[PDB]
Amino acid sequence: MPNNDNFDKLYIWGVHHPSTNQEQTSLYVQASGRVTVSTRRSQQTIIPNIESR
Amino acid sequence: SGTLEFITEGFTWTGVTQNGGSNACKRGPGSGFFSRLNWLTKSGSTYPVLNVTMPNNDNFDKLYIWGVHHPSTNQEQTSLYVQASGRVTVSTRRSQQTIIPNIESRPWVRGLSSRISIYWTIVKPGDVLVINSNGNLIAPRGYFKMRTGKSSIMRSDAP
Amino acid sequence: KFHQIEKEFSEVEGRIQDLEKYVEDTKIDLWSYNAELLVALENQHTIDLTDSEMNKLF
Ligand SMILES: *[C@@H]1O[C@H](CO)[C@@H](O)[C@H](O)[C@H]1NC(C)=O
Ligand SMILES: *[C@@H]1O[C@H](CO)[C@@H](O)[C@H](O)[C@H]1NC(C)=O
């Protein structure tokens, strides 16, 4: 999603943290997910954590 | 510190190919790389577990600059480092930095989707630098001698 | 004074940036007060000592 306007855009996003490995697979198929958001200047990579809370 | 005084050290990197470069970082007509960094890749069909040590027997603090390569694809990762997941660790008697490289594509910058993450370590006298890596290490060529002084930096466009 | 903290920022970072800005903004306000007060006190005294010098002569 490119920024062609004349102002700064603030994007809010998140990463789901399942409580069990069964939940993880039921929703996202893969046993381990991954989320990366980036720009030409920055990058944020997050590996979701599976655990009972 | 107010200085870029760099002292080259030998560092024995066995079982790996040294002095890797790229067309994004040309020096002269041919490809090149950061002069103070050493890009290590596989030798033949293996990238062994590197386990090198460099002690500080001098009467000053040593500053080391090193890095970690982040490939854009899993094939890139394997072609360079054989193993699907690399690892880089640098340590001293009191401190440690461990990083597992992430394989990910970025917006194309100077015709490249890959990157390098730069890190730094300080070694006091009587301490030792330990580098351990099974992959993706951008090794240091030596150290920068640290000074405490009246120096600084300023952003300006004045002549 | 030689090496100091950064006082201008190209990007929005967060909590640490706000503190750096606050520390400097605070510093400038305190010194601007000291400057305003000093000149006021010095000027009043200069006006008094010059008037005093006239009376001493008289
Ligand atoms: C920088 O200084 C060190 C001092 O030992 C020397 O070994 C090195 O060759 C110098 N490099 C350059 C580019 O002058
Ligand atoms: C690296 O060398 C050190 C030397 O003290 C040794 O203790 C360590 O076991 C070596 N690394 C591995 C993976 O064996």
Q: CA C6 to CA C8: how far, in whole Å? A: 6
Long-range contact list for A41-45, CB < 8 A, 24+ apart?
Answer: A41/C11, A43/B104, A43/B106, A43/B115, A45/B102, A45/B104
Which residue from B49, B51, B132 has its CB within 8 A of the most atoms of ligand 2, so it is best to mutate? B51
- Residue B152 to residue C8, Cβ atoms within 8 A: no
The region, left, alpha or beta by phi > 0 then psi within -120 to 50, assigned to residue B9 is: beta
In one-letter notation, the amino acid at residue B88 is V
Tally of CA atoms within 13 A in the half-sphere of A11 that contains its CB: 9
3-state secondary structure B26-68: EECCEEECCCCEEECEEECCECCCEEEEEECCCCCCEEEEEEE
Q: How many residues does chain A have?
A: 53
CB atoms within 10 A of CB B156: 5
3-state secondary structure B132-157: EEEECEEEECEEEECCCCCCCCCCCC
CB atoms within 10 A of CB B90: 23
Q: Compute and round to an integer the Cα radius of gyration of chain C.
A: 21
Q: Compute and round to an integer the Cα radius of gyration of chain B.
A: 17
In one-letter notation, the amino acid at residue B131 is I
Q: CA C30 to CA B135: how far, in whole Å? A: 54
Beta strand B30-32 with B87-91 is unpaired
Q: CA B157 to CA B153: how far, in whole Å? A: 13
Contact partners, residue A39, CB within 8 Å, separation at least 6: B107
**Is B9 touching ligand 1 by the criterion CB < 6 Å?**
no
The region, left, alpha or beta by phi > 0 then psi within -120 to 50, assigned to residue C27 is: alpha
Residue C33: DSSP 8-state: H
Among B130, B111, B137, B146, smallest CA distance to B22 is for B111
CA-CA-CA-CA torsion sign (B1, B6, B12, B15) = positive
Q: Which domains does chain B have, with CATH numbers?
A: 1-158 (3.90.209.20)
Q: How many residues does chain C have?
A: 58
Q: CA B7 to CA B61: how far, in whole Å? A: 13
Pick from A39, A40, A45: CB nearest B102: A45
Among B10, B11, B35, smallest CA distance to B25 is for B35
CA distance B124 to chain C (A): 23
Among B127, B159, B155, smallest CA distance to B143 is for B127
Say yes or no: C4 contacts chain B, CB-CB below 8 A: yes
Cβ-contact A11, A44 below 8 angstroms: no
Going from the C-alpha of B101 to that of each of A19, B73, B87, B106, the distances in angstroms are 26, 12, 6, 14
Q: Mapping DSSP to helix (H, G, I), strand (E, B) and coil, where does residue A51 land? A: coil
Q: CA C57 to CA B110: how far, in whole Å? A: 82
Q: CA A42 to CA B65: how far, in whole Å? A: 21
Cβ-contact A50, A18 below 8 angstroms: yes
Q: How many residues does chain B have?
A: 159
Cβ-contact B139, B11 below 8 angstroms: yes
Q: Mapping DSSP to helix (H, G, I), strand (E, B) and coil, where does residue C27 land? A: helix
